[PDB]
Paper text:
After establishing the specificity of compound C for NLRP3, the cryo-EM structure of MBP-hNLRP3-ΔPYD in complex with ADP and compound C was assessed. It formed a tetramer via the MBP-NACHT and back–back (between LRR and LRR) interactions with D2 symmetry. Two non-protein densities were observed in the NACHT core with the Walker A motif situated in between, and modeled as ADP, and compound C, respectively. This proximity supports the improved nanoDSF stabilization of compound C in the presence of ADP. A comparison of the interactions of compound C and MCC950 with NLRP3 revealed that both compounds bind to the same pocket however interact with the protein differently. The tricyclic moieties of MCC950 and compound C are deeply embedded in a hydrophobic pocket, while the amide moiety linker of each compound is anchored by different amino acid residues. MCC950’s linker is anchored by the Walker A motif and Arg578 with Arg351, while compound C’s linker is anchored by the Walker A motif and Arg578 with Asp662, placed further away from the Walker A motif. The isopropyl furan moiety of MCC950 or pyrimidine moiety of compound C points outward towards the LRR region. Hydrogen–deuterium exchange (HDx) mass spectrometry analysis revealed Walker A&B motifs showed reduced deuterium uptake upon compound C binding, suggesting the binding of compound C could perturb the ATPase hydrolysis activity of the NACHT domain. Indeed, an ATPase hydrolysis assay showed that compound C inhibits the ATPase hydrolysis activity of MBP-hNLRP3-ΔPYD similar to reference compound MCC950. Together, these data indicate that compound C locks NLRP3 in the closed state by interacting with all the NACHT subdomains and inhibiting the ATP hydrolysis necessary for NLRP3 activation.
Residue numbers in the entry:
A (entry chain C): -230 to 176, 201 to 276
B (entry chain A): 657 to 686, 725 to 1035
C (entry chain D): 784 to 910
Write the structure that this text describes.
Amino acid sequence: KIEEGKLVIWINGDKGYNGLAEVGKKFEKDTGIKVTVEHPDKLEEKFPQVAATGDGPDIIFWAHDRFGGYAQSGLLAEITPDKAFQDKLYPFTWDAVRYNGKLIAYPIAVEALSLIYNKDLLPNPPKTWEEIPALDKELKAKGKSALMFNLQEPYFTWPLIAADGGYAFKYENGKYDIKDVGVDNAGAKAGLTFLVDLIKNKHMNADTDYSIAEAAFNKGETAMTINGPWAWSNIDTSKVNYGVTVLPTFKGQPSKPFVGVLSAGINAASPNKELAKEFLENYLLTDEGLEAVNKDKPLGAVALKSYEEELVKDPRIAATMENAQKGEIMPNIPQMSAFWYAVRTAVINAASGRQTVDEALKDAQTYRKKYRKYVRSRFQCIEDRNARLGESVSLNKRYTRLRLIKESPIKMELLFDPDDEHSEPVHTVVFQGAAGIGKTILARKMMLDWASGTLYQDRFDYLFYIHCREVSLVTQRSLGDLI
Amino acid sequence: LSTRMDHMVSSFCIENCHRVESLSLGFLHNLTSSFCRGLFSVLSTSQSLTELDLSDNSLGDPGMRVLCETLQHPGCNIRRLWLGRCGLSHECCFDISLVLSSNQKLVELDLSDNALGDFGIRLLCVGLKHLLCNLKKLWLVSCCLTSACCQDLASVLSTSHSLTRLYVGENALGDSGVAILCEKAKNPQCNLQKLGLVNSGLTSVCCSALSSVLSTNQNLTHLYLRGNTLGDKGIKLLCEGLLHPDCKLQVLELDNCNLTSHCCWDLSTLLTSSQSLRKLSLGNNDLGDLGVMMFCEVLKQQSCLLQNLGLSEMYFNYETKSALETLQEEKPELTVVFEPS
Amino acid sequence: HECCFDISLVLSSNQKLVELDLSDNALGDFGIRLLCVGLKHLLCNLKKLWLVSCCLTSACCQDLASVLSTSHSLTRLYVGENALGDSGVAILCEKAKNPQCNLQKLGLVNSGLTSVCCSALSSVLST
Ligand SMILES: C[C@H](CCC(=O)NCCC[N+](C)(C)CCCS(=O)(=O)[O-])[C@H]1CC[C@H]2[C@@H]3[C@H](O)C[C@@H]4C[C@H](O)CC[C@]4(C)[C@H]3C[C@H](O)[C@]12C
Ligand SMILES: Nc1ncnc2c1ncn2[C@@H]1O[C@H](COP(=O)(O)OP(=O)(O)O)[C@@H](O)[C@H]1O
Ligand SMILES: CCc1nn(CC(=O)Nc2ccncn2)c(=O)c2cc3sccc3n12
């Protein structure tokens, strides 16, 4: 079902809906063709189904990242602006809507994570990330923190991680290189290492979430936090003299926040290609068109070159666009869902529980090896406790071979093997001897030799030591001795 | 059938039958003789018989010769012939080839678990490359084959207008072997649809050859590599092929393939990138307890995968099982995930 | 026997080969079965075939006999030093007796022949 004869627009209700409708109504009066604007809930879930049917809107207003998924499915029409139109919008936003070389949507507005600060505590924010530690120490003397932000959401840590040459997916010729991921290289490692060190130095905790960072800022406990324009509406109620600026540099480079570009896509099945194109190109993407939208709900930084100059009167918007210009276009490839997960489990665990070098190393700790090494280390000393005339390590190389016989001498290896024949293996082996004969020493040597890969390498994956001296008979427990 | 009495009784009833679609025989301690000849002579005239199953019984080469003669009958009409653990040797391949060269009704031939060594293949290929051979499905699983035989199988893949299903797993068709098959399977005109390189000892080295085929051959819909120690590097290379926009592979089976945590990134990429993949049977391998959590998270964004996601024969923690159960309930279009329980 | 397949291919297309000596090779009965494919094929102009001491048994005579029957060019057949006993000779004779058989020289030299098979040879000699 194609809605021929009319132009239909779907947009999130949290956007300048009434304004866009005004642009539509003006368009109608100027051209004679009516434009209908609707704002259904979860349009990002329903649009893909109607677009795949031919039903639904002609124009879709949403984030440019999701549009890449539609483009892969072929649910969006190609847009065909000339250079006369392409040069109207910022030169870096055209990549936001570029899928494998094709343009699939018109950039409308540009979001970025800017630095939000409290002029009452810090009228002069630092220009270098390295200065924050010192700032925090000075503020701590005053009882305030230099910087607090959400560290449980990688979206806000990225600006720093990518600062030293790190990147998500390489963007070379208009197409993202899916197999080339920049979260692993030195540029990312240096950034993350620095961030983790800031946590260890108690400038930031590891568990700050969105609500905590905002509450602390709006309360006056922190000099500054990091956020996007979407949150500005909740920063006025504090009546704090706040400002917005460009984030600090790292080793000479600017931070690189993910840049989220709002764009207007067109339905693949719609015949209203010239109609949708002219609507967006010569009416909406104008200073007057954007004012109609901004009038209802502020767009923050906008894709229009001329409109941003008009809005330069507000430094918050100027800072946002400056950050976006220096930032990284957030890739529109569906592989980002994997990326977001990959960083979510990177930053949180890197902050506490393992090192930043460990984090990227294929989860090399597969437990089996982790335990073997734990055992290898733990049993290097004959006692690994006090009482040795200075507590020096005796060194287990001092072990002198004890005689082992069956109730010819035998070896520690082949100990659990079947006897002469019958294919009958032994599960239980008992080592008997007088107290002081070396029962414990043999057991400790055995575990060390196993951990080092010199005994029972193929037969056992785990050895669990039960020290009968430590295990009581009356204490209730499950088989937690394994822990 | 046990004794001569059973042969004349079975012969009588089968001959006087006008609606038997499938016959399964099981010669017991009687062949390697003409003892069964009397019955095979009946099968030749049964116009309603489409499937003849002679698997898992001793049918010595001489017996296979008798059968082949009975399959050259103008009125044979047998479309499916199953010859599993029959104890056949390369000697019978000559007689099979003769049948393929004239019997235009035979479509599915299963020669698995016979000693049809490389030489035997060389002979079967004579029939397979011959016009009038309409064979579509061929199983050569566990036939004591080596890479040498791929030189002839590859020629069949290149010229056959009819062969679509080729299963050559459980053999020594290692890296060099598959590379030969790939070189010809690569051709856009190859009619190969299902490639059963199940357990051929394949390694990461040859995955570039499989990748090439996946990239170019748009007719290949099913690829089974389970049991090959492909490794993580192997998956990486295969993915490069699978991520190519022209790849049409629908089903990829990867059971124990000596996989580890690293490959999860490439598999995750595969899950969301390919528009063709429908089934990805990751099996008994150490995929990783965190690796699978990435799958859980990404398989929400309108993934095209609908079928088995594997993850069987793999131990997962509580939170992981919960996430997988949640996925199964939230996205019913994914038939079944298939956890261990 | 593995090479017999490739020999057969040559016989099927090489119209110049006249004399082929495959003596003292392990071209068992199966190998003969394959060579006979080429030998029974038109364009095969082979006139002399030596299969002396090739680990053959009487079973192979079923195919050699067919070659003798249909081959327009095979005149020399040497199959001695094999296990082509009485029953094998009888099989060959049943086709060699045909007035149209082109066999000129028959080398049943040392094949374990006995008095029993002599009637079969007698038939061939008479016809
Ligand atoms: C997206 C990249 C993969 C691509 C990559 O790493 N590409 C370049 C590497 C090779 N280079 C030679 C170019 C550089 C060497 C770095 S070196 O530091 O040696 O100089 C890899 C690298 C580290 C990977 C994570 C960890 O595994 C831990 C964990 C394992 C689980 O299962 C799945 C989840 C998780 C969080 C993983 C996600 C993802 O999978 C990451 C980010
Ligand atoms: N080479 C050795 N082999 C065994 N025991 C040794 C050796 N050298 C010193 N010892 C000492 O012998 C004692 C053996 O204690 P043991 O009777 O095995 O302990 P438990 O009663 O806990 O089994 C310890 O004091 C230990 O340090
Ligand atoms: C010197 C005493 C001693 N003797 N023996 C031998 C022994 O116990 N023989 C039998 C025989 C029959 N029944 C019981 N014991 C030890 O083994 C021994 C160990 C540890 S520690 C301190 C002295 C000691 N010790």
